[PDB]
């Protein structure tokens, strides 16, 4: 199974502004954790056709579980949007130490406010661990030596395969490669503005936007590296886990193993897609603060 533990729950979070004004946060381990048990629950029901019908009920519970969790993280809206409008000062300052300190504070208050609800979240996540784990314990076979892996196959086909091939069709190394040129430019444009050239203003902000972008790129480097791994791992693994029988225990081991592999895979792919957006979200605001190729 997968438990939740301690972790310094400060850096176990990411704050991501897809478009200008639509900022949100993650809580990696939760998202892994919930997803982990989302797959398990499916796998559990699909293993027989006698219980494929649960899909509606499970969709139900999972729809709810997110609509529950989303409502909780809502309690941090008026503090999150306190950040948003502080960002908007940073990404549109058309003084600085104060606009920085304001960002660091309004951010830390958003962290705390999340951490505060560390236990309101756990109940949702434990309720999910419950549902997913209560099935799985229900997963019966026709013959324990010789259990059927069509369960895992259908679950791979529908929910997963679509996302693998998406990652294969998108050349994420290009994606990275490009961003590292984007930063190269920012860097070149910033080195140009440096020098004794009197001293044009805003540069502080640019520096900050760039710095921020770097940290984003480095995160995207990371989740991307994990993605490409798990792709090969998932693809290798799934081959071994279909069109065959299993011993009940080895089976259960597989599903969990996969439920794990998928979860990590998705979480990354997710954060990547969010970060990617957040990357260029800054590029626009950074590009804006230029006005044109050279004022």
């Amino acid at each position, epitope marked *: 199974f997968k438990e939740l533990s301690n972790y310094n729950i400060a850096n176990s979070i990411d704050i991501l502004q897809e478009k200008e004004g639509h900022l949100d946060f993650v809580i990696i381990p939760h998202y892994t954790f919930l997803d982990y048990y989302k797959h398990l629950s499916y796998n559990s029901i699909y293993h027989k056709s006698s219980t494929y019908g649960k899909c509606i009920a499970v969709d139900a519970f999972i729809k709810k579980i997110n609509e529950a969790y989303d409502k909780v993280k809502s309690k941090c809206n008026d503090i999150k949007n306190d950040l948003i409008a502080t960002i908007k000062k940073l990404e549109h300052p058309y003084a600085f130490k104060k606009m920085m300190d304001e960002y660091n504070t309004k951010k830390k208050k958003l962290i705390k406010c999340i951490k505060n609800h560390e236990n309101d979240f756990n109940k949702i996540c434990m309720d999910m661990k419950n549902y997913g784990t209560n099935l799985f314990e229900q997963l019966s076979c026709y013959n324990n*030596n010789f259990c059927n892996t069509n369960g895992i196959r259908y679950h791979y086909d529908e929910y997963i395969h679509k996302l693998i091939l998406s990652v294969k069709s998108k050349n994420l190394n290009k994606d990275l490669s490009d961003m590292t040129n984007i930063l190269q430019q920012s860097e070149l444009l910033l080195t140009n503005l440096n020098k004794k050239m009197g001293s044009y203003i805003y540069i502080d902000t640019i520096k900050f936007i760039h710095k921020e972008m770097k940290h984003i790129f480095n995160r995207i480097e990371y989740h991307t590296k994990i993605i490409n791994d798990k792709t090969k791992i998932i693809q290798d693994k799934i081959k*071994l886990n279909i069109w065959r029988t299993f011993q009940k225990d*080895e089976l259960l081991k597989r599903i969990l193993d996969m439920s794990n592999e998928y979860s990590l895979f998705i979480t990354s792919d997710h954060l990547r897609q969010m970060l990617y957006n957040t990357f260029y979200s800054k590029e626009k605001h950074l590009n804006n603060i230029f006005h044109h190729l050279i004022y």
Partner: antibody
Amino acid sequence: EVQLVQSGAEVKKPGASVKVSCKASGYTFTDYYIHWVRQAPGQGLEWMGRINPNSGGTNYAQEFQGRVTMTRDTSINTAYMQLTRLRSDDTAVYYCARDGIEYSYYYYAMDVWGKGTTVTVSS
Amino acid sequence: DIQMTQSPSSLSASVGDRVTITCRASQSISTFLNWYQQKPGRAPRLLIYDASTLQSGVPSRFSGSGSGTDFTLTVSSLQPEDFATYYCQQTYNIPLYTFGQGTKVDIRR
């Protein structure tokens, strides 16, 4: 170096029990599965079960289901295999081995073996 | 419920011969099949794992092969020090099935 160390030969009567040990030394104990393969006199190898030192989970052949009981203590890095309801035929050499060659993610080979324990069942 | 059958159970081989030991699975098992040497009154030695990879340090005359049901262990030039009983083990399904009877390697003539 990498070493498996088993208890000394035992002798037990029809319808006693028998515990044998397997001290893992060299490597981290709870990494690799530890397995118990016995061998009748002048006979083939015979897989009995396994135990995940880490979890404590056990998988037994069905021949020994309900007779064998595998355990381990992580203070000492020792894995155990207790048979019960002993019989003439249970007379064998009990080996223990290490699935530490993971060759296909879930697929392992018994890379290290202990020299193995002579259990005699006589009366 | 995977039954591993080794052919010849017992055979006769002079030094410097090639020795090829067969091992058939009752069902398809991929390349999940390891090979063991066991000298009279010794612990089994792991030679070949995963049907045809060779365990570090093992003499390179031992060569695993085959797939699906039929597997082969091949000693290029049989040596004195190889006069053992050999065992093949399927790992495809995890009550690892009892290795097939194993094969005897005498001298000959």
